[PDB]
Amino acid sequence: ARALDLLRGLPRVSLANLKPNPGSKKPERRPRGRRRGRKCG
């Protein structure tokens, strides 16, 4: 694999680098602001 060989050059994986797979977490919509809430849907 070329990918572990990429992991050499990168800083160490820590609890400060972690990130969910993009697409996993849809963002919560909540009723504040001009669009999400005046009559709030």
Binding site: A3, L6, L10, P11, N17, N21
Partner: protein
């Protein structure tokens, strides 16, 4: 009650003149309707096969290792 000035009549009239010349240039087609038939059927069909083809070629993008690992750089430091 509203009344019609000279501006309004002259404006109306110059629109009528443009209209009359539109009537003139539409009075002499280059082809008959029998001649024009299917003279552009190929290009229309290819155009729609392009629309159809862009419609049926819709799919999620490729996901790369380099992007996911490239998130590790948020804690790149100096030494």
């Amino acid at each position: 009650p509203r009344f019609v000035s000279l501006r309004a009549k002259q404006n109306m009239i110059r629109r009528l003149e443009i209209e009359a010349e539109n009537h003139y240039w539409l009075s002499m087609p280059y082809m008959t309707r029998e001649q024009e038939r299917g003279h552009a059927a190929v290009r229309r069909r290819e155009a729609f096969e392009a629309i159809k083809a862009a419609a049926t070629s819709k799919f999620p993008p490729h996901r790369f290792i380099a992007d996911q690992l490239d998130h590790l750089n948020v804690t790149k430091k100096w030494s």
